[PDB]
Design a protein around this motif. Structure first.
Motif, PDB file in Angstrom:
ATOM      1  N   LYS A  25       0.826  -1.196   0.000  1.00  0.00           N
ATOM      2  CA  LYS A  25       0.000   0.000   0.000  1.00  0.00           C
ATOM      3  C   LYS A  25       0.868   1.258   0.000  1.00  0.00           C
ATOM      4  O   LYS A  25       1.717   1.434   0.869  1.00  0.00           O
ATOM      5  CB  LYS A  25      -0.955  -0.010   1.196  1.00  0.00           C
ATOM      6  N   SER A  74       2.117  -4.896  15.421  1.00  0.00           N
ATOM      7  CA  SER A  74       1.503  -3.619  15.074  1.00  0.00           C
ATOM      8  C   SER A  74       0.782  -3.016  16.276  1.00  0.00           C
ATOM      9  O   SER A  74       0.344  -3.730  17.176  1.00  0.00           O
ATOM     10  CB  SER A  74       0.542  -3.776  13.891  1.00  0.00           C
ATOM     11  N   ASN A 113       0.063   0.848   8.090  1.00  0.00           N
ATOM     12  CA  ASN A 113      -0.543  -0.180   7.248  1.00  0.00           C
ATOM     13  C   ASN A 113       0.447  -1.037   6.455  1.00  0.00           C
ATOM     14  O   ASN A 113       0.090  -1.610   5.431  1.00  0.00           O
ATOM     15  CB  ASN A 113      -1.547   0.475   6.298  1.00  0.00           C
ATOM     16  N   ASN A 162      -2.570   0.674  11.232  1.00  0.00           N
ATOM     17  CA  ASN A 162      -1.540  -0.059  11.956  1.00  0.00           C
ATOM     18  C   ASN A 162      -0.195   0.641  11.916  1.00  0.00           C
ATOM     19  O   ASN A 162       0.383   0.796  10.843  1.00  0.00           O
ATOM     20  CB  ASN A 162      -1.351  -1.449  11.364  1.00  0.00           C
TER      21      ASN A 162
HETATM   22  C1  LIG Z   1      -3.622  -4.397  10.945  1.00  0.00           C
HETATM   23  O1  LIG Z   1      -3.081  -5.353  11.837  1.00  0.00           O
HETATM   24  C2  LIG Z   1      -3.907  -6.506  12.038  1.00  0.00           C
HETATM   25  C3  LIG Z   1      -3.237  -7.328  13.111  1.00  0.00           C
HETATM   26  O2  LIG Z   1      -2.713  -6.505  14.145  1.00  0.00           O
HETATM   27  C4  LIG Z   1      -4.058  -7.246  10.715  1.00  0.00           C
HETATM   28  O3  LIG Z   1      -4.882  -8.392  10.904  1.00  0.00           O
HETATM   29  C5  LIG Z   1      -4.661  -6.308   9.678  1.00  0.00           C
HETATM   30  O4  LIG Z   1      -4.722  -6.963   8.416  1.00  0.00           O
HETATM   31  C6  LIG Z   1      -3.826  -5.028   9.567  1.00  0.00           C
HETATM   32  N1  LIG Z   1      -4.459  -4.069   8.672  1.00  0.00           N
HETATM   33  C7  LIG Z   1      -3.921  -3.670   7.512  1.00  0.00           C
HETATM   34  C8  LIG Z   1      -2.619  -4.306   7.137  1.00  0.00           C
HETATM   35  O5  LIG Z   1      -4.467  -2.838   6.794  1.00  0.00           O
END
Ligand SMILES: *[C@@H]1O[C@H](CO)[C@@H](O)[C@H](O)[C@H]1NC(C)=O
Ligand SMILES: *[C@@H]1O[C@H](CO)[C@@H](O)[C@H](O)[C@H]1NC(C)=O
Ligand SMILES: *[C@@H]1O[C@H](CO)[C@@H](O)[C@H](O)[C@H]1NC(C)=O
Ligand SMILES: *[C@@H]1O[C@H](CO)[C@@H](O)[C@H](O)[C@H]1NC(C)=O
Ligand SMILES: *[C@@H]1O[C@H](CO)[C@@H](O)[C@H](O)[C@H]1NC(C)=O
Ligand SMILES: *[C@@H]1O[C@H](CO)[C@@H](O)[C@H](O)[C@H]1NC(C)=O
Ligand SMILES: *[C@@H]1O[C@H](CO)[C@@H](O)[C@H](O)[C@H]1NC(C)=O
Ligand SMILES: *[C@@H]1O[C@H](CO)[C@@H](O)[C@H](O)[C@H]1NC(C)=O
Ligand SMILES: *[C@@H]1O[C@H](CO)[C@@H](O)[C@H](O)[C@H]1NC(C)=O
Ligand SMILES: *[C@@H]1O[C@H](CO)[C@@H](O)[C@H](O)[C@H]1NC(C)=O
Lengths: 208, 342, 228
Positions: free
Chosen positions: B136, B175, B146, B298
């Motif tokens: 991303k 994260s 993210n 995240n």
């Molecule tokens: C954010 O983190 C969670 C786990 O902490 C993950 O499952 C999720 O896919 C993440 N979101 C994103 C990468 O956009």
């Protein structure tokens, strides 16, 4: 972290300057030249790579942590101060100045007790004069009741004399009046190439 | 037999045709559909050197994100080169989607699979792939959002730690969510919420990792020494709006030495006059949209700079960095490099 | 051709602030950092910090944290330096520098190929103080066939310089007046000496003349052998 040596080189045109820098860390080392009244100039970078415009008389080497800048066949434009550098760190610098050759001459040594007029002030200055010697390199050490002194003296050196090509140096030992009257024997010891052994001039405080 | 080389990569994604979202629309015209059955070949007895800080994949991604922003987030006024450009600046739908970068025929991407790989040096488990993972194009400063997380331990990344001019990328293995919000009914005022319990524990682990790289010296965090708001504050785009969040509370040395536990709320503000990360100049945008503006991200990484100077102290000082958006792409592309087959 | 042009020299008092500029040209201003380095005679050159034009990102040397501010103007491609709470230790020549290797994609900050011409900044009190002049007496016994040394110690004056002559300039041979030194007290001192025939000590009079223009001081001091 960067230890540059020596502090001063006194050389004639045609001779070679050898300047060394000891490092303790990791990184490319550079060398700069500062001509009198001018901005510093990059001479060497990355240990031995000559900058643009630098003649091959300048060369950099490295043995372990010791980096060396050697300048062969000295010209007028070569004299000035040199600095080694690693990242934001710089050496103390090496002054390369013009020296005119002549025969070796021992210094005449003179010591001067503090004036009575000064002792009223609460401070005492003891002066040691090294007169008309060559070459420039000379060591002066102060002893008070045969104890080596450190951190309470300052030296000054004249420019090479335009007539007899000699140098002169004065060392000043500064003590408090109280600390001065605590001791008896004041001595400056002079070592120089023109002396077969180090020469000591001294006086006993009080007696004339 | 192959050698390290560079080429013109193509892009792949899962962009939808019905989406009016900006990244989707761009990817629709610029990318191909992803491969449902990607192939990865694990190379045995093969050791390869990598260097994330000299990876030209990064240069091409940068060109793409610039082109995307230029073709989409058009300012009302573009103040550059002494001249003034007035365009139309309608509100848009903004939400970064994953983007894959792939090699043409004759070229292949090598992927490092060492769990503790720091970005440079040799790599033991190497595999062969045609495309990267979905990345991303999130543009931010101070915090990486993210992104992907480190496999095992927290990884410290730098072209050269001894060089204070080189950016440091801290790659997290866990994260920590950041929840930013601009509530409906000062319209430009906003805030970010962070679980202080998770963050301070993560931050503590970061300092312990840094101790390993700096001879067990005292590790201290400080706010930035200066610069534009884009870097002295946490800068990021949420739903088309530019956010500027103050992160002084995120780097509390006291809480990693009681009472600090709880919820951290960072003061944010939505600006309309911003400095463009494309290196252009200043851009002026419309007032923020009505309603509840919110995005949950995240925190997967931290951008730091390290203090220098002719000192002898027994503490190292680190400050939130960023501003070079190419570093954002390095933090995801670090495990890939392009090679040419003969 | 890369060039860096700095603002002119200036004189400051303790407590003041100073501001200098460095205008760059001949390259893409945003591609690489600008550094500030100050040179003080006798001391190691000191790196003060760098500044990256892109977003005005800065990194200051630890020992200057809180006193220094580096900024830039993007339009005029000019970098600025400000240093607050000046003291004597800030007296130096100030340079802006930029690394040799600088492209749109990569740089190395530290190989300083490019230097500005330098901005001299002097920081000194407006106060003045005249010298104390003490004699440096010859010896006790006059050797009729040797040479004697005498002089006067010129101590605790500010600022530079003082000059010394002997017998109002009538005596020049064998005179050495040394470069001054800066003492811990912040005050200067020097010595002036002269060698003379020891046979003239009972006949000739030796006066050192000390001049110190800033304090409007002219002092004559007779140097004679101690009586005992
Ligand atoms: C954010 O983190 C969670 C786990 O902490 C993950 O499952 C999720 O896919 C993440 N979101 C994103 C990468 O956009
Ligand atoms: C780190 O810097 C040194 C010089 O400062 C350089 O020779 C070395 O290659 C650099 N290391 C990496 C991994 O780039
Ligand atoms: C690297 O090698 C091990 C052993 O074959 C394997 O289990 C692991 O999954 C590999 N790493 C990745 C990221 O595939
Ligand atoms: C990464 O690993 C390489 C190879 O061992 C090493 O030379 C380099 O110093 C490491 N870098 C960091 C930031 O740990
Ligand atoms: C993340 O790495 C740290 C070491 O820096 C470690 O203590 C921690 O357990 C790791 N988190 C995991 C494995 O979830
Ligand atoms: C984010 O914070 C808002 C209030 O500030 C709250 O209403 C919302 O539920 C939060 N979102 C998440 C996912 O926790
Ligand atoms: C913060 O996260 C912890 C888990 O790490 C959770 O137990 C706690 O309830 C959270 N704090 C708040 C205020 O929600
Ligand atoms: C960030 O917030 C703190 C909170 O006290 C404030 O002191 C500081 O000035 C803020 N930083 C900026 C760059 O506004
Ligand atoms: C760190 O936490 C303490 C205790 O909660 C607080 O008083 C202090 O203001 C915090 N530091 C910041 C916000 O920088
Ligand atoms: C991160 O991803 C979530 C959904 O996966 C999205 O809601 C959020 O806006 C993203 N954050 C940023 C800063 O783009």
């Amino acid at each position: 972290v960067l230890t540059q040596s020596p502090g001063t080189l006194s050389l004639s045109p045609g001779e070679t300057a050898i300047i060394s820098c000891r490092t303790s860390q990791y990184g490319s080392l550079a060398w700069y030249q500062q001509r009198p009244g001018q901005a510093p100039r990059l001479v060497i970078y990355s240990g031995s790579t000559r900058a643009a415009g630098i003649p091959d008389r300048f060369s950099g080497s490295r043995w372990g942590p010791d980096y060396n800048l050697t300048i062969s066949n000295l010209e007028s434009g070569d004299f000035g101060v040199y600095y080694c550098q690693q990242y934001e760190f710089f050496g103390q610098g090496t002054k390369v100045q013009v020296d005119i050759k002549r025969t070796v001459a021992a210094p005449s040594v003179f010591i001067f007790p503090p004036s009575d007029e000064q002792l009223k002030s609460g401070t005492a200055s003891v002066v040691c004069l090294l007169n008309n010697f060559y070459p420039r390199e000379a060591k002066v050490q102060w002893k008070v009741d045969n104890a080596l002194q450190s951190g309470n003296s300052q030296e000054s050196v004249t420019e090479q004399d335009s007539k007899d090509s000699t140098y002169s140096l004065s060392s000043t030992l500064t003590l408090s009046k109280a600390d001065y009257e605590k001791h008896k024997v004041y001595a400056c010891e002079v070592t120089h190439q023109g002396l077969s052994s180090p020469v000591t001039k001294s006086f006993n405080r009080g007696e004339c | 037999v192959w050698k390290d080389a560079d080429t013109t990569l193509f892009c792949a994604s899962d962009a939808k045709a019905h989406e009016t979202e900006v990244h989707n629309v761009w990817a629709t015209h610029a990318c191909v559909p992803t491969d449902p059955n990607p192939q990865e070949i694990h190379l045995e007895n093969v050791t390869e050197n990598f260097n994330m800080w000299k990876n030209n994949m990064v240069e091409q991604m940068q060109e793409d994100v610039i082109s995307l922003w230029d073709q989409s987030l058009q300012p009302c006024v573009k103040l550059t080169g002494g001249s003034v450009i007035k365009q139309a600046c309608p509100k848009i739908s903004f939400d970064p989607i994953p983007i894959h970068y792939c090699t043409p025929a004759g070229y292949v991407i090598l992927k490092c699979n060492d769990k503790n790989f720091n970005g440079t040096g040799p790599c033991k488990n190497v595999s062969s792939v045609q495309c990267t993972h979905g990345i991303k194009p999130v543009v931010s400063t101070q915090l990486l959002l993210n992104g992907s997380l480190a496999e095992e331990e927290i990884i410290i990344r730098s072209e050269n730690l001894t060089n204070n001019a080189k950016t440091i990328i801290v790659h997290l293995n866990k994260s920590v969510e950041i929840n930013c919000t601009r509530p409906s009914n000062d319209i430009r005022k906003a805030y970010c919420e962070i679980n202080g319990t998770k963050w301070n524990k993560v931050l503590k682990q970061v300092t312990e990792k840094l101790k390993e790289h700096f001879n067990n010296k005292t590790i201290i965090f400080q706010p930035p020494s200066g610069g534009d708001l884009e870097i002295t504050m946490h800068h990021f785009n949420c739903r088309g709006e530019f956010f500027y969040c103050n992160t002084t509370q995120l780097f509390n040395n006291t809480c990693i030495g009681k009472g600090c536990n709880g919820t951290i709320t960072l003061p944010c503000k939505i600006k309309q006059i911003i400095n463009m990360w494309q290196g252009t100049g200043q851009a002026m945008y419309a007032p923020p949209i009505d309603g509840k503006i919110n995005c949950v991200s995240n925190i997967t990484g931290i951008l730091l700079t390290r203090d220098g100077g002719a000192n002898n102290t027994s503490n190292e000082t680190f400050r939130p960095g960023g501003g070079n958006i190419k570093d954002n792409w390095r933090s995801e592309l670090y495990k890939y490099k392009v090679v040419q087959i003969e | 051709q890369v060039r860096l042009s700095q603002s002119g020299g200036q004189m400051k008092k303790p407590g003041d602030s100073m501001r200098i500029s460095c205008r760059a040209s001949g390259y893409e201003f945003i591609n690489c950092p600008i550094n500030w380095i100050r040179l003080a005679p006798g001391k190691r050159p000191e790196w003060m910090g760098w500044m990256k034009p892109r977003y005005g990102a800065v990194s200051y040397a630890r020992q200057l944290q809180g006193r220094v501010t580096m900024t830039r103007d993007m339009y005029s491609e000019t970098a600025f330096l400000e240093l607050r709470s000046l003291t004597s230790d800030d007296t130096a020549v100030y340079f802006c520098t930029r690394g040799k290797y600088c492209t749109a994609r990569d740089y190395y900050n530290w190989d300083f190929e490019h230097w500005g011409q330098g901005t001299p900044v002097t920081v000194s009190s407006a106060s003045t103080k005249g010298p104390s002049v003490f004699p440096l007496a010859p010896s006790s016994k006059s050797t009729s066939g040797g040479t004697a040394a005498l002089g006067c110690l010129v101590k605790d004056y500010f600022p530079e310089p003082v000059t010394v002559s002997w017998n109002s300039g009538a005596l020049t041979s064998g005179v050495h007046t040394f470069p001054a030194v800066l003492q811990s007290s912040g005050l200067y001192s020097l010595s002036s000496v002269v060698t003379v025939p020891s046979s003239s000590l009972g006949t000739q009079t030796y006066i050192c003349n000390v001049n110190h223009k800033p304090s409007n001081t002219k002092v004559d001091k007779k140097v004679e052998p101690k009586s005992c």
